[PDB]
Amino acid sequence: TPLPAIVPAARKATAAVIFLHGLGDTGHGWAEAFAGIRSSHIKYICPHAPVRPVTLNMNVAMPSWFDIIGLSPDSQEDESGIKQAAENIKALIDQEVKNGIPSNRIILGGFSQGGALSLYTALTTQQKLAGVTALSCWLPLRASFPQGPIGGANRDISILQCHGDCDPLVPLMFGSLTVEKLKTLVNPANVTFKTYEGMMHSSCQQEMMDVKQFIDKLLPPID
Ligand SMILES: O=C(CN1CCN(C(=O)c2ccco2)CC1)Nc1cc(C(F)(F)F)ccc1Cl
Ligand SMILES: [Cl-]
Numbered sequence: 001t002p003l004p005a006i007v008p009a010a011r012k013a014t015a016a017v018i019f020l021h022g023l024g025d026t027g028h029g030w031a032e033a034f035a036g037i038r039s040s041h042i043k044y045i046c047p048h049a050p051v052r053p054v055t056l057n058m059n060v061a062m063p064s065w066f067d068i069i070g071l072s073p074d075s076q077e078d079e080s081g082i083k084q085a086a087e088n089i090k091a092l093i094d095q096e097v098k099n100g101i102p103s104n105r106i107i108l109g110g111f112s113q114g115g116a117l118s119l120y121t122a123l124t125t126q127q128k129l130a131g132v133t134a135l136s137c138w139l140p141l142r143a144s145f146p147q148g149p150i151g152g153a154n155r156d157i158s159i160l161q162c163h164g165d166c167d168p169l170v171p172l173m174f175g176s177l178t179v180e181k182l183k184t185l186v187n188p189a190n191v192t193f194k195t196y197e198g199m200m201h202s203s204c205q206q207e208m209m210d211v212k213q214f215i216d217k218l219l220p221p222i223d
């Protein structure tokens, strides 16, 4: 708690989207973005990161899923916080399953550190998921993954990875290096990289339209 921001389905939800915001934010802005592309049968859940000290910014307390120590290829990542946060997301997936939405009808996603967390959670959980929408982010703890395919429940998971070509905070190059790594961890036929010309560390309407088409293709209406 506080309770996640929820976009209810218009009718009993047969699928769900769990979207994780980035550093400094809450789930409200992203909930309004998903409300503008909402499908009648999908529930959208945007949980709020706890407020915690961020090492990168002199331990200033701000909403963050885990600690951030640096932005360069050699920078250390918060292994314990990332794993802890991923088990918390797995518990939210579990709640949705027990409450009637199978995990193969759930898409996980996020922006920046939230996107990184969504990839890490999807690529470690054995709860089969429908897909991932990874926006302006990177694969965290990349060296801990195998050198080949991950195997397991989510070996054929569909992933939409989005990036702004003018991102001044998460270089396009880290988005590209991440998708090249995702194409070796899972079936590459279901991994798609979309880039938005002129977009910085932000979102845009064309990206939300591509996210909507991906969500609708993977979580179509069912009888
Ligand atoms: O935490 C990190 C660590 N970063 C190391 C460098 N890296 C890779 O070399 C790479 C290539 C493929 C996968 O990883 C990405 C991760 N970064 C980050 C955080 C923020 C924000 F959280 F503070 F906002 C912003 C921007 C950045 Cl880059
Ligand atoms: Cl419902």
Ligand SMILES: [Cl-]
Pocket (backbone or CB within 6 Å): 022, 023, 111, 112, 113, 114
């Ligand atoms: Cl972030």
Ligand SMILES: [Cl-]
Pocket (backbone or CB within 6 Å): 014, 041, 220, 221, 222, 223
């Ligand atoms: Cl349906």
